[PDB]
Design a protein around this ligand. Structure first.
Ligand SMILES: Nc1ncnc2c1ncn2[C@@H]1O[C@H](COP(=O)(O)OP(=O)(O)OP(O)(O)=S)[C@@H](O)[C@H]1O
Ligand SMILES: [Mg+2]
Ligand SMILES: [Mg+2]
Length: 270
């Protein structure tokens, strides 16, 4: 019944977005540390209903590789979302530009990413904006899928919904999102995970946009893998990427089969 600021000390700005801010908050009596996403519902006409949907999706989630939702408050136009504080920051900041990261680290992050995406898809949720900026790390560098503001239900009461809305981030979106009027949700998340893995192993994104207009994408379809970023990627993970970054979503590898992939299961040393 008392104000947010009387219970919570904002200690640190963690991130700044167009529609909200994320603060590290410390409870003034408990001293427990929390991430609070502060959202001014004045900044968009349908933000009230968009943030309500984000909260309803968050309340369905409970997995070690998904940022945990603790609750929410409203104070006038302000919505507070309390989330698991991820001390380790963004996966994005572990990706050295043009370099990437050690293959064992990339593999480990990929394992954890798959675990979270499998969980989400199992409860019928698609994230729709998977990228290193939305994959956070806890104090033990465990990966946690973050930000469900673009997430939606693709399976409900055992019936699948095809998607028809364009959203996400252009270097990470699957080509069917640019070309088809309707598309299945799961292969889109699979595709973006493959871009994430490409970024982890090479430190760069392969194309602006998986368009016929984009030469980098056409060179990939012609498997000119002597070019960058592919030449930086060992043939074993590259064989997996060849199975993920497949244009036709009906032929694209599914996660159950990613789990059977040689590199996925290859023991790696430092
Ligand atoms: N739970 C968290 N723990 C630690 N850091 C976080 C957490 N949530 C967000 N951040 C940081 O805040 C940044 C932005 O938060 P997001 O939720 O991704 O905001 P955004 O989507 O960029 O902003 P808008 O308003 O949706 S355009 C992230 O990239 C993290 O660096
Ligand atoms: Mg985000
Ligand atoms: Mg967001």
């Amino acid at each position: 019944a008392v104000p947010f600021v009387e219970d919570w000390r904002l200690v640190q700005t963690l991130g700044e977005g167009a529609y909200g801010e994320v603060q590290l908050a410390v409870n003034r009596v408990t001293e427990e540390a929390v991430a609070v996403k502060i959202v001014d519902m004045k900044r968009a006409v349908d933000c009230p209903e968009n943030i309500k949907k984000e909260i309803c999706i968050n309340k369905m989630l409970n997995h070690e590789n998904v940022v945990k939702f603790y609750g929410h408050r409203r104070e006038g136009n302000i919505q507070y979302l309390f989330l698991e504080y991820c001390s380790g920051g963004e996966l994005f900041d572990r990706i050295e530009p043009d370099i990437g990261m050690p293959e064992p680290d990339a593999q480990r992050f990929f394992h954890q990413l798959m675990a979270g995406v499998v969980y989400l898809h199992g409860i019928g949720i698609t994230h729709r904006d998977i990228k290193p900026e939305n994959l956070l790390l806890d104090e033990r560098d465990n990966l946690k899928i973050s930000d469900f503001g673009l997430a939606t239900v693709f399976r409900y009461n055992n019936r699948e919904r095809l998607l028809n809305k364009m959203c996400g981030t252009l270097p990470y979106v699957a080509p069917e999102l640019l070309k088809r009027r309707e598309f299945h949700a799961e292969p889109v998340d699979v595709w973006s995970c493959g871009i994430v893995l490409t970024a982890m192993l090479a430190g760069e994104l392969p194309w602006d946009q998986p368009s016929d207009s984009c030469q980098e994408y056409s060179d990939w379809k012609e498997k000119k893998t002597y070019l960058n970023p592919w030449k930086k990627i060992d043939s074993a993970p590259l064989a997996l990427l060849h199975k993920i970054l497949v244009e036709n979503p009906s032929a694209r590898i599914t996660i159950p089969d990613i789990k059977k992939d040689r590199w996925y299961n290859k023991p790696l040393k430092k």
